[PDB]
Scaffold this active site. Structure first.
Site, PDB file in Angstrom:
ATOM      1  N   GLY A 244      88.592 -66.501 120.376  1.00 36.36           N
ATOM      2  CA  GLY A 244      88.274 -65.559 121.376  1.00 36.36           C
ATOM      3  C   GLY A 244      89.645 -64.354 120.815  1.00 36.36           C
ATOM      4  N   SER A 245      91.017 -65.115 121.428  1.00 32.39           N
ATOM      5  CA  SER A 245      92.457 -63.937 121.280  1.00 32.39           C
ATOM      6  C   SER A 245      92.874 -64.159 119.896  1.00 32.39           C
ATOM      7  CB  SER A 245      92.995 -64.350 122.415  1.00 32.39           C
ATOM      8  OG  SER A 245      92.430 -63.620 123.259  1.00 32.39           O
ATOM      9  N   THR A 246      92.996 -65.173 119.386  1.00 34.52           N
ATOM     10  CA  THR A 246      93.009 -65.292 118.220  1.00 34.52           C
ATOM     11  C   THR A 246      92.403 -64.659 116.747  1.00 34.52           C
ATOM     12  OG1 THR A 246      92.080 -67.455 117.576  1.00 34.52           O
ATOM     13  CG2 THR A 246      94.131 -67.862 118.977  1.00 34.52           C
ATOM     14  N   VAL A 247      91.661 -63.951 117.199  1.00 37.82           N
ATOM     15  CA  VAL A 247      91.061 -63.256 115.780  1.00 37.82           C
ATOM     16  C   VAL A 247      91.241 -61.579 117.127  1.00 37.82           C
ATOM     17  CG1 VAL A 247      88.978 -64.169 115.147  1.00 37.82           C
ATOM     18  CG2 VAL A 247      88.358 -63.592 117.197  1.00 37.82           C
ATOM     19  N   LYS A 248      92.144 -61.395 117.959  1.00 40.80           N
ATOM     20  CA  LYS A 248      92.019 -59.788 117.938  1.00 40.80           C
ATOM     21  C   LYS A 248      92.864 -59.816 116.980  1.00 40.80           C
ATOM     22  CE  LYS A 248      92.183 -60.290 122.254  1.00 40.80           C
ATOM     23  NZ  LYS A 248      92.470 -60.302 124.117  1.00 40.80           N
TER      24      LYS A 248
END
Length: 503
Positions: A244-248
Site C-alpha cells: 500500500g502506502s509503504t511503496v509510495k
C-alpha cells in the site's frame, strides 16, 4: 545363513549460534534403545517389566513384538537421556541394545522459533535454518560392517570408512539481543491492540544481514506436541500482502529519476477523489488542494501519487520496485518462503497504473519490504539478503541513484519529524525516517504497517513492523505500528552502540 548389515556412525550435527556466538541449536548426546525380536522371544517373562520402563501397556507391547517376530530390528524409544537409558539397561532384558544418538535442543526457544527451525527424529532439518543449511550442519556420518550369525553374535565389526566428520558451526545474521527486543515488543503490541498476528523484521542496511526476524504467534520448538497450524507460520516470510502506502516512496524515486519532478513541485489533489472510468480513487484526508511531494507522503494521498503516476508512467515505477526486490525471489533459499507478485503489464492502463503506484497492485512479504527500505537507506544500493553472518560483504547493486535516494531519505525524515507527520514513529536521540501504511483485507479487517530506517545522517538499520487485524483501538499504521517501530529502533540502535545524531 549369516547376516551382513551396514550401520551408520552418527555425525555430531553442527552448532547454530547467533552472530555473537550465543547458542541457538545444539546437538546433545542421547540414548535410543532397540531390540532384536528373535532374542526377545526367548525371554517373554521379561517383557512386562520393560513395558513399565517404556510407559507402555503390557498387552500392546507384547502384541507389537509378536507381530514383528520375523524381523531382526525394531525401535523401543529414541532420545532418552544417558541416565534415562541406564535405568532401562539395568533391567538386563535379553534382546535390548543401545546406541548413542544426537538430538537437537534450542536454548533461545520460542524467541527465535521460525528463524532457526528444527530437525526430524533422524536429526535432519525440516524447518527454518536447520533445513536450508542441512548439508552444512549435518556432517558426514561413518559406516560399520557388522557380521552376525542369525542367533545373536557379532563375528566381525569394522569401520569401512573414515571417522564420522562433525557438521560445521553456523553463526546466524540474527543478533539475539535485538531479536529478544523485537520479540517482546511485537508481543506487547498484540495484547495492547488485540491483534491476531504480527511480524517484525530488522535489517542491517550496509551488510544485507537480517538482524532480527520475529513472528507472532510463536511456539517453543523444544515442546512440539500441542502445535497449532498458525503458530508455526513464518509470517515475515510466508504472509504475502499489499504494501500500500509503504511503496509510495518507490513510486517517488521513479518520479525523481524521471527528470520531471522535484520535491517542491506541486500536485492538485482536490477534492480528495479521482474518477477513472467508474473506478473512483479516494484519499482518507480530504482537506487538501495543492500538496508537494513530501505533503503527498505526509497526508498519504492516493490521489496525489496516482496523478504523478500518470505523468511519468507505470513502466518507470515498476522498474524501481522490481530492482529493490519486491515480488522477486529473495535468494535466502528458505522452505516454502513466499515470493509475492509484481505483475509486469509492460504497458499499463490508467487504473492499473494508479493501483500499482499506491501499492494495491502488488503483493509482498515483510522481508521484501525491509530489504527495499534497506536499499533506500543505503543510498539506493541493494546489498544481497543474508540469514547467516556476513563477514565479507558482497558488492551491491546500485538500483536507485545516490542523489535520488538521498532526496527520498530526506522526505521520509520529514514525514516522521514534520508538523502533522507520523510523530509516534520518532526515535528519541536519533533522526528517524519511514512511512506508515494501512491495508484493508478483502467486517472490515486491517493490516497496520510501518516501514523505516535510522539514523538519517548515516542509516544503519531498516525496520518493518506488521500488525494483523487489531481491534482494541484505532487501526492506522501511524497509531498502531509507529510506536512499535519507535521502541524497537530506540533499543536496537543503542544495543549496537550507534551514536546519537540529533545533536
Amino acid at each position: 545363513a549369516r547376516s551382513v548389515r551396514h550401520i551408520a556412525i552418527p555425525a555430531h550435527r553442527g552448532l547454530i549460534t547467533d552472530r555473537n556466538g550465543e547458542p541457538l541449536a545444539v546437538s546433545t548426546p542421547v540414548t535410543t534403545l532397540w531390540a532384536n525380536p528373535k532374542e526377545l522371544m526367548t525371554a517373554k517373562e521379561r517383557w512386562p517389566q520393560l513395558a513399565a520402563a517404556l510407559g507402555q501397556d503390557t498387552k500392546l507391547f507384547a502384541d507389537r513384538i509378536e507381530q514383528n517376530a520375523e524381523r531382526e530390528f525394531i525401535y523401543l524409544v529414541r532420545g532418552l537421556t544417558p541416565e534415562q537409558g541406564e535405568g532401562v539397561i539395568a533391567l538386563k532384558v535379553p534382546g535390548v541394545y543401545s546406541i548413542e544418538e544426537f538430538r537437537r535442543f534450542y536454548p533461545a526457544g520460542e524467541v527465535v522459533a521460525h528463524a532457526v527451525g528444527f530437525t526430524d527424529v533422524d536429526d535432519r532439518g525440516r524447518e527454518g535454518i536447520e533445513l536450508a543449511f542441512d548439508e552444512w550442519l549435518a556432517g558426514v556420518p561413518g559406516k560399520r560392517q557388522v557380521l552376525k550369525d542369525r542367533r545373536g553374535r557379532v563375528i566381525k565389526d569394522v569401520q569401512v570408512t573414515k571417522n564420522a566428520k562433525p557438521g560445521k558451526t553456523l553463526a546466524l545474521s540474527i543478533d539475539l539481543r535485538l531479536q529478544y527486543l523485537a520479540h517482546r515488543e511485537l508481543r506487547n503490541a498484540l495484547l495492547e491492540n488485540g491483534a491476531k498476528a504480527g511480524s517484525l523484521v530488522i535489517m542491517d542496511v550496509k551488510t544485507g544481514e537480517i538482524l532480527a526476524m520475529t513472528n507472532q504467534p510463536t511456539y517453543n520448538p523444544n515442546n512440539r506436541r500441542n502445535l497449532q497450524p498458525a503458530a508455526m507460520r513464518n509470517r515475515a516470510m510466508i504472509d504475502v500482502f499489499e504494501p500500500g502506502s509503504t511503496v509510495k516512496p518507490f513510486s517517488m524515486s521513479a518520479a525523481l529519476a524521471s527528470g520531471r519532478w522535484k520535491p517542491s513541485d506541486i500536485v492538485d489533489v482536490y477534492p480528495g477523489t479521482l474518477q477513472i472510468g467508474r473506478y473512483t480513487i479516494r484519499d482518507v484526508s480530504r482537506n487538501s488542494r495543492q500538496l508537494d511531494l513530501t505533503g503527498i507522503l505526509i497526508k498519504s494521498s492516493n490521489v496525489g501519487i496516482s496523478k504523478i503516476a500518470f505523468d511519468i508512467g507505470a513502466e518507470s515505477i515498476y522498474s524501481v520496485m522490481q530492482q529493490v526486490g519486491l515480488g522477486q525471489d529473495t535468494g535466502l533459499g528458505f522452505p516454502g518462503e513466499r515470493v509475492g507478485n509484481l505483475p509486469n503489464h509492460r504497458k499499463w492502463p490508467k487504473a492499473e497504473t494508479a493501483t500499482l503506484a499506491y501499492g494495491y497492485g502488488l503483493s509482498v512479504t515483510a522481508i521484501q519490504l525491509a530489504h527495499a527500505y534497506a536499499a533506500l537507506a543505503n543510498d539506493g544500493k541493494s546489498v544481497p539478503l543474508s540469514m547467516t553472518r556476513v563477514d565479507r560483504v558482497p558488492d551491491g547493486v546500485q538500483v536507485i541513484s545516490p542523489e535520488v535516494a538521498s532526496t527520498v531519505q530526506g522526505m521520509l525524515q520529514q514525514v516522521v519529524e514534520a508538523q502533522g507527520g507520523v510523530f509516534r514513529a520518532q526515535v528519541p536521540g536519533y533522526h528517524a525516517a519511514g512511512k506508515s501504511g494501512t491495508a484493508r483485507k478483502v467486517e472490515n479487517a486491517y493490516r497496520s504497517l510501518f516501514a523505516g530506517f535510522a539514523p538519517a545522517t548515516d542509516p544503519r538499520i531498516a525496520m518493518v513492523v506488521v500488525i494483523d487485524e487489531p481491534s482494541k483501538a484505532g487501526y492506522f499504521g501511524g497509531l498502531v505500528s509507529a510506536p512499535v517501530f519507535s521502541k524497537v529502533m530506540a533499543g536496537a540502535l543503542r544495543l549496537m552502540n550507534v551514536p546519537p545524531d540529533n545533536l
